[PDB]
Nucleic acid binder design. Sequence first.
DNA 1: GTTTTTAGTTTATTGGGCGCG
DNA 2: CGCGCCCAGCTCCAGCTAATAAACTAAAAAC
Lengths: 531, 501, 7
Amino acid sequence: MHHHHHHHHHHENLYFQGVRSGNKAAVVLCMDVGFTMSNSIPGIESPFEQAKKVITMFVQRQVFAENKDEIALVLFGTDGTDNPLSGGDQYQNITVHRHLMLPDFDLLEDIESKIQPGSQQADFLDALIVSMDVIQHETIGKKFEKRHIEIFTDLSSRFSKSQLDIIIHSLKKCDISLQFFLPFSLGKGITEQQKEGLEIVKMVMISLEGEDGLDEIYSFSESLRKLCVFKKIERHSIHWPCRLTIGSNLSIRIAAYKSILQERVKKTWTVVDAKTLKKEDIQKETVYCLETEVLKEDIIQGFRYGSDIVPFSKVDEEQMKYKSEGKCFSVLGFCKSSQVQRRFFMGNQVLKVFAARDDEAAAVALSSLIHALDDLDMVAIVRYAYDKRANPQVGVAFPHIKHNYECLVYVQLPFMEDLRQYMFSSLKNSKKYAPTEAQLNAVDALIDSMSLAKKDEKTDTLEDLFPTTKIPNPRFQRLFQCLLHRALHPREPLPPIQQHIWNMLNPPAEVTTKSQIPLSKIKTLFPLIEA
Amino acid sequence: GRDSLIFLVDASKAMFESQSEDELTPFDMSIQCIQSVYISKIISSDRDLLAVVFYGTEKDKNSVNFKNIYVLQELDNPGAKRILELDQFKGQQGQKRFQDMMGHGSDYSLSEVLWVCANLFSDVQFKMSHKRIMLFTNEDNPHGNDSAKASRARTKAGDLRDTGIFLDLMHLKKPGGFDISLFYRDIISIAEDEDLRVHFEESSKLEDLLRKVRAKETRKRALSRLKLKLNKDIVISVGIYNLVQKALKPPPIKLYRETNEPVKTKTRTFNTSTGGLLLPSDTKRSQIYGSRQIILEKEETEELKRFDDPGLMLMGFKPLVLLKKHHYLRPSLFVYPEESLVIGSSTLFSALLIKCLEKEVAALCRYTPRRNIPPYFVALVPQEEELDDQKIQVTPPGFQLVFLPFADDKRKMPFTEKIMATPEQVGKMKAIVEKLRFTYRSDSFENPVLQQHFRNLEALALDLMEPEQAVDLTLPKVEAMNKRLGSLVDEFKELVYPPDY
Amino acid sequence: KPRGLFS
DNA sequence: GTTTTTAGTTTATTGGGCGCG
DNA sequence: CGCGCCCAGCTCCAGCTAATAAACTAAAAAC
């Protein structure tokens, strides 16, 4: 479930609009490289190094993401001055290191080696003005849904408060959002100048966003904790409008979206010549033979019917083809939820079905169905067809219990032809493999020790100690780590799997210690040997 | 090799006698069941060989000219003509066609009958994996009047079982019931761990006879044999099976018009400039990110996919209530112990199964189906065995391998304001729901697309003027539903939809 | 609701 | 060897108003 | 009625854009 500010447009398929409209964002990273940014306590990393790592993490994630967002980099406290606002003696020690453009590996390499800490100090509000200028002068022609400025500073140095009103007015008028990144977490031995700087930062954020403005002030530490993992795959499900029918006289306007699917990266490996390193140099030629070669001008379509070979052209097949009415969602009947076993769930998707957008009458009608099925512990058996061409399916539509939203969940059920009737030997009724009382007690102790759940405050509510559905797919994280490693270090072999990845794929360390003891008893009680 | 199944049908007087006038005769039931298997084997492009033999017929047709045995169809791949041939004996008209074509009620000797069947396996040029004889009869004591015949039948039946030929009985309804212990108890092939409990009841409906036949006709086929690791040292062997597999429209096959023979297809990779064949060691893998070409070796694109060694790694045990019904990702699999690889696997498996059931808990695992594949979290859901009224295994005992989605696989829903219905509206809907109540069975619906596709092929292979039209079982029975609901629809509408809608 | 750098 | 199944791709199309037979 | 044809919105002007089913190939495993 999304926030209320998230428009439904993102889910509806329109010509280069909605899902098809390129959601682009302009980001200006405003980094403090001033003298004080290098000054740190012998125990903790300098703000400069901390901010540098946050920025690298952000840019790295953006390089592999599909977003197409544009990134610029403004530095302040540098020895030199490179500004379109410099004039004579204004906005000094502020450098536009990178102009608004797609991030690349040349930027990341540049961040790592070319950016050095400065010996000067600059006005952070002046750096913000320069940052606003970048967005104002470079978003020209380009279509950006969002414009953001991220400021990384220690707030250690003096600054003028004279431009506060022009700063706020331009951010509001140009719809530019702001975010602050500091060495410390927002509530402490910060300087008096830092306390002054922070009050202004607080005022700015409150003027722009209100009470929620304070939530846009972060520590570099918390930012590194959130940016260390690669960006998970987020796609907007296309809005599927249709009518849920009960007989031929009752119709309910509905809108369905894909809840679950086997998500994958779109971009894959291109087979290229080992020498030219180009795609066009490789070509696939599929030939036909009986041994004796055959020309395309001599092949017809056919199908096998057991031992029979039946010639059937695509033209004839097109007309004799089964024809059904498309975009159909029809109730066949209702049954006990118990009669529909989850072991029979078929297909590659799960559909969440809501009432048609902005239709109260449809919403009430569907809410009636949802609650009736829930209160009767029943489900609907429906006929589902995506469009006029799509093969129809038989599936289940069951109620979904949440307080923020009510919906029917659609999952395909099998056809008789899909079921595989295999008989397996009874294990309960086995004279050979029945376990002893001691063996059963060891397994009982194992299951208790290896519990992945815990009851909080005796509220009879189970807290999952190992969720797995919150974990991002490690395949993508791994692919990206390697792709990045090969880009920055071409001579180096592929790196090993990062520890945090393994750490998230393993159960809590508590579970592992408890497991080993009953596991040891199991190894002695259950003899196991290869045949 | 190819598996072999011989359908042996009794043509005695009792086979053409219906117990219930509305119910089909055991013979008609048998013919219809055989035809179904023939069609199903075509739908799934099965390479098994089928045969049709009749005994007790006045006419005889077999290699050694044994009396009262008619080999209608020798062991061969099923086809359109063979199915059409079986259709000639379907129904009351068919009963007349059979009896006038071959006769019935004549004397026979099961020993001679079994010899003919065993010989059909021998005549097959291709090698065979399984040799199975399926007997359809409503006679539980064929030679209860002739010891000489009964004894020869037992000896011959014994000889077949020792040879590796399985003899399965598809006993049909008889007044006073069918008693297997009287004679067939010593003929039928019995598995060493069954002890007669696993034997099905007599068939009185085509539906039951069909499932019972289908249950023995197909052998278990594991998707993969994997190790289930409780830890590095404690490893049990398991078989992974696909309970449900999407039956797809068979892909087209390329033929020459003049020869009507299938054509082989070779796909090669060659350099555009040189024209020479490309070895896998002559190409590399590329991906373009941030205005840069990133090159990896084929070996490296596989290495970057490697995490765990193939198998199931036990993470722990999670209560079933924590596994969401709406977190379906892809069809679930079935886990069963493989005693042939690791001795002691079944005992440990049984223990895990017994205790997971008692505690209503699932075994969470990190699953790697094959080498060089990233892992997926799966929940092994305990599954208790279930047998129906006919003694057919509805639910096999083991674990349901339920795939769990990663954060990436989940999709956030668009914002919708919550609007709830009144108890009066819910009440009307409840009454509607109760009106359209029905008993759901996983085998109630047939694929309209598949059915029509093969009906079309039947018409073309038999040169029929018109293709048979399939009945779309997926379409709602609109008229019936409307009558069944009556005014409930109009009542619901008045409570929900404004006249200005 | 993630914004700017975190979104 | 063989076949069977799947994992992993690539590819075409999308929405709707208007004029035609 | 159902079919193909042809503009759609956003920064003068041609090119953007992306989920989704359905068709497709390569490749691993079992047999």
